[PDB]
């Protein structure tokens, strides 16, 4: 059985939150959070790993047009690399692929996609992998207003994905099952960044539909 709670905050796994901007760039930080985890894991060092690399060279996605993080970790890998920030700067606009091989902070064997809606092995695979990436229907006005609390709303639809995040632990809060989840849009959104999403409530927002981590 994996532990009751995990907090990759705490493990020193979680790089500060990034605000996108206008850019349809959630699919990038989400992939980026993921990659900055298994970084971390293998090398000991946190860093920030460029999610404008991803915007510029993914092709299979449509950069500030949206994209899915399965093809993200795909390009890292058949790539041989993503960038660091610092190398490879955000600027939340798309531009001509600058990948440079001398800014390589990271590497992806391949990735693995979640059971859909299973979220046991989205748990077990946050407790013994690290951050996942994670999908959800962020649609509704609640969650834009999200400040404190476990997030459920009855009209969150799991068949309707639209917005990209991180989920870097789980736990629970006065009986309430959370996933903990690390958002792109800056520290004044949520909670400093961050929303707990209701877990163990019927694939609350569709958080387990569209879940992947990369492999290093
Ligand atoms: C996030 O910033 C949240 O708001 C934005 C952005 N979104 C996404 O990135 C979502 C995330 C999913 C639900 C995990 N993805 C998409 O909406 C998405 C995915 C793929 C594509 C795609 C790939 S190639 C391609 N095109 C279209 C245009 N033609 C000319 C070339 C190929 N499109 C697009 C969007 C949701 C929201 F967009
Ligand atoms: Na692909």
Redesign the pocket.
């Known amino acids: 059985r994996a532990p009751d709670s995990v907090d990759y905050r705490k493990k020193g796994y979680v790089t500060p939150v990034k605000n996108?901007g206008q850019c349809?760039?959630?699919?990038a930080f989400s992939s980026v959070g993921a990659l900055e985890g298994q970084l971390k894991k293998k090398t000991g060092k946190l860093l920030n790993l460029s999610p404008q690399n991803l915007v510029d060279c993914v092709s299979?996605?449509?950069g500030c047009?949206?994209?899915?993080?399965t093809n993200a970790f795909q390009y890292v890998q058949k790539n041989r690399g993503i960038d660091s920030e610092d190398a490879y700067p955000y600027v939340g606009q798309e531009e001509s692929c600058m990948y440079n091989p001398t800014g390589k902070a990271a590497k992806c064997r391949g990735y693995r996609e979640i059971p859909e809606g299973n979220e046991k092995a989205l748990k077990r695979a946050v407790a013994r992998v690290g951050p996942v990436s994670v999908?959800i229907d962020a649609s509704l006005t609640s969650f834009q207003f999200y400040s404190k609390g476990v997030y459920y709303d009855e009209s969150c639809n799991s068949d309707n994905?639209?917005?990209?995040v991180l989920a870097v632990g789980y736990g629970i809060q006065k009986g309430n099952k959370h996933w903990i989840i690390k958002n792109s849009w800056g520290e004044n959104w949520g909670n400093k960044g961050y929303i707990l999403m209701a877990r163990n409530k019927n694939n609350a927002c569709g958080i387990a539909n569209?879940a992947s981590f990369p492999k290093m």
Not at 24 to 27: A, E, V
Request: some cysteine; glycine content about 22%; proline content about 0%.
């Open positions: 996108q349809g760039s959630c699919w299979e996605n449509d047009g949206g994209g899915y993080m999908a994905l639209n917005h990209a569209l």
